[PDB]
C-alpha cells in the first residue's frame, strides 16, 4: 500500500541536482506536486545563504520555488530559539543566512552575556568570533549549532565544515551543542510548523542515508531516498527510486484535478 502523503520536504543539499538531466526531472517533479496543489518546503542545512538566495536560484531553472517554500536550517534555528524564550538575545557566529533569520524571528544579537551561542559556517571567523562565544557559554549561554557537517565538498577538496567550526567552543568550554540540522529531527520539526502538516502525512524527499534519511526517521516520518548513481540494524528508508520521475504517477494518483 501506498500512504497519502498531504506536505512534502524536499532536500537540496544532494547530487540530485546534478547535471541538465537531473535538474530537469526536479523541475517535472516539484511542478506535479505544485500542479496537484500540494504543499512542499526545500530544505536545506546550509545556514548562510538566505531563502530568497535560494529560491532566485531554483527559479533559474524552472523550479517553482517562492522565498517561503525554502526553509534552512537557519529557519529552524532562529524559530527554535524563539520557543524557548521570545525575547532571547544570542551571541551569533555565521553568515547571512543565519542572522536573517534571527533578526525576522523577533530576537536580538548579542554578546559575552547573551541568553544563547549560535555557531553557522563563517569563512570570515577570527579568534575573537570564538573567544566572545566561549566566555557567553561559560557566562550561562545555551550552545547551539546549526548544523554538524564535519567537512564541505569543494573543487579544492574537503573544506572545513560546520561542525568543525562549531567543535571549538565545545572543546574549549566542555559544553554540548544542540544540533538543529540534519541528521537531528529539529530541523523536521520545524519545517513541519511552516508546512502545516503532521508526521504521518509529511514525506521526506532526499539523496543522502546518513544526513537526509536519519533525519526522517529521527523525527518519525516516511522517507523517500533518491538513488542518484545497509547493515541490518539499519532502519530501511519508506521509499526508494533511482529518479524523481518515478514518483511522479504516485502524485497524480494520490491528488487528483
Not at 518546503?41 to 536560484?57: E, G, H, I, Y
Not at 533569520?101 to 536580538?108: K, R, V
Not at 565538498?153 to 567543535?167: A, K, Q, Y
Not at 540534519?182 to 502538516?197: C, D, F, H, N, Y
Request: with cysteine; hydrophobic share 35%.
Amino acid at each position: 500500500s501506498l500512504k497519502t502523503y498531504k506536505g512534502y520536504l524536499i532536500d537540496l543539499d544532494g547530487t540530485m541536482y546534478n547535471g541538465t538531466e537531473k535538474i530537469e526531472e526536479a523541475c517535472e517533479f516539484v511542478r506535479t506536486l505544485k500542479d496537484r496543489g500540494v504543499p512542499y518546503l526545500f530544505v536545506t542545512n546550509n545556514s548562510s545563504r538566505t531563502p530568497k538566495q535560494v529560491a532566485d536560484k531554483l527559479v533559474s531553472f524552472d523550479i517553482p520555488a517562492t522565498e517561503e517554500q525554502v526553509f534552512t536550517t537557519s529557519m529552524a534555528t532562529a524559530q527554535h530559539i524563539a520557543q524557548q524564550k521570545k525575547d532571547a538575545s544570542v551571541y551569533v557566529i555565521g553568515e547571512e543566512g543565519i542572522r536573517q533569520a534571527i533578526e525576522e524571528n523577533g530576537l536580538t544579537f548579542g554578546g559575552e552575556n547573551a541568553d544563547f551561542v549560535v555557531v553557522g559556517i563563517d569563512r570570515s571567523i577570527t579568534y575573537e568570533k570564538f573567544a566572545v562565544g566561549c566566555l557567553a557559554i561559560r557566562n550561562g549561554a545555551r550552545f547551539i549549532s546549526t548544523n554538524g557537517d564535519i567537512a564541505i565538498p569543494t573543487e579544492r577538496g574537503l573544506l572545513p565544515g560546520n561542525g568543525s567550526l562549531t567543535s571549538v567552543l565545545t572543546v574549549s568550554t566542555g559544553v554540548q551543542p544542540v544540533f538543529i540540522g540534519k541528521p537531528e529531527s529539529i530541523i523536521m520539526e520545524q519545517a513541519m510548523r511552516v508546512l502545516g502538516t503532521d508526521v504521518s502525512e509529511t514525506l521526506m524527499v532526499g539523496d543522502n542515508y546518513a544526513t537526509d534519511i536519519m533525519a526522517g526517521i529521527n523525527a518519525g516520518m516516511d522517507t523517500l531516498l533518491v538513488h542518484t548513481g545497509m547493515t541490518d540494524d539499519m532502519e530501511k528508508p519508506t521509499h526508494a527510486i533511482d529518479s524523481l520521475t518515478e514518483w511522479i504517477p504516485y502524485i497524480e494518483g494520490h491528488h487528483h484535478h
